[PDB]
Curated annotation (Swiss-Prot), chain E:
<comment type="function">
    <text>Attaches the virion to the cell membrane by interacting with host receptor, initiating the infection. The major receptor is host ACE2. When S2/S2' has been cleaved, binding to the receptor triggers direct fusion at the cell membrane. When S2/S2' has not been cleaved, binding to the receptor results in internalization of the virus by endocytosis using host TFRC and GRM2 and leading to fusion of the virion membrane with the host endosomal membrane. Alternatively, may use NRP1/NRP2 and integrin as entry receptors.</text>
</comment>
<feature type="glycosylation site" description="N-linked (GlcNAc...) (complex) asparagine; by host">
    <location>
        <position position="2"/>
    </location>
</feature>
<comment type="subunit">
    <text>Binds to host ACE2. RBD also interacts with the N-linked glycan on 'Asn-90' of ACE2. Cleavage of S generates a polybasic C-terminal sequence on S1 that binds to host Neuropilin-1 (NRP1) and Neuropilin-2 (NRP2) receptors. Interacts with host integrin alpha-5/beta-1 (ITGA5:ITGB1) and with ACE2 in complex with integrin alpha-5/beta-1 (ITGA5:ITGB1). May interact via cytoplasmic c-terminus with M protein. May interact (via N-terminus) with host bilirubin and biliverdin, thereby preventing antibody binding to the SARS-CoV-2 spike NTD via an allosteric mechanism.</text>
</comment>
<protein>
    <recommendedName>
        <fullName>Spike protein S1</fullName>
    </recommendedName>
</protein>
């Protein structure tokens, strides 16, 4: 998933965009993946209960 | 090959191990991608 | 802007079998196409 | 009646960053989210046993 | 880039560039080039 960014893989995001600019997309991807992982952990906790 | 080395093949940057391939690719294909945008295979732009 | 030519040959109306079309040539130029016409060799 | 599940451990760097080295330097600024996730997964693994 | 005649905003020219080696280092090295804007790409990362 792109998670609102221009690309899904961050390896080319760090290779095509400058560090001052790619930080927004990297933080967007990090926030999206952290939210997905937290939702997964909440669902796993409900399943474990 | 057969060693953990940083590969840069036609702009594709990353870290992985290059091994001997046993799969047969079609003559028009150039990339093999796994589930969730996982680059599993690649062809050499020099020796094909 | 790229004209694509996909073709596949299979020995044999159209049968109920399944067969995919494999890419043959990818022309990197495209024009404004509205009509087309075939040619014969009688 | 099910009594146990599959104990799953998710890594933070390999999932969020993968094989990127510049990405691992940015996860340290978010705090201890991964510490919470690993602790919850370890708790679930001990709970199933 | 340094052609003698350039077209207007209508019926603009378009050239197909393929099977060669591009070198964008000469572009930003020129003095009278004032504005150099890009979308999603960086000027320094155009060589890799």
């Amino acid at each position: 998933s792109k998670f609102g960014a221009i690309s899904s893989v961050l390896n080319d995001i760090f290779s095509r965009l400058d560090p001052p600019e790619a930080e927004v997309q990297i933080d967007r991807l990090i926030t999206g993946r952290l939210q997905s992982l937290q939702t997964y952990v909440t669902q796993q906790l409900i399943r474990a209960a | 090959k057969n060693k953990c080395v940083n590969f840069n093949f036609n702009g594709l940057k990353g870290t992985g191990v290059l091994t001997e391939s046993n799969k047969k690719f079609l003559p028009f294909q150039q990339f093999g991608r796994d589930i969730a945008d996982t680059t599993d295979a690649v062809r050499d732009p020099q020796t094909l | 802007g790229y004209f694509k030519i996909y073709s596949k040959h299979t020995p044999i109306d159209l049968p109920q079998g399944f067969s995919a079309l494999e890419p043959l040539v990818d022309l990197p130029i495209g024009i404004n196409i509205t009509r087309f016409q075939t040619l014969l060799a009688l | 009646l099910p009594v146990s599940m599959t104990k799953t451990s998710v890594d933070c760097t390999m999932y969020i960053c993968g094989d990127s080295t510049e990405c691992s330097n940015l996860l340290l600024q978010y705090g201890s989210f991964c510490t919470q996730l690993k602790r919850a997964l370890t708790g679930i693994a001990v709970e199933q046993d | 880039f340094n052609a003698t005649r350039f077209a207007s905003v209508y019926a603009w020219n378009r050239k197909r560039i393929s099977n060669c080696v591009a070198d964008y280092s000469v572009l930003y090295n020129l003095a009278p080039f004032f504005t150099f804007k890009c979308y999603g790409v960086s000027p320094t990362k155009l060589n890799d």
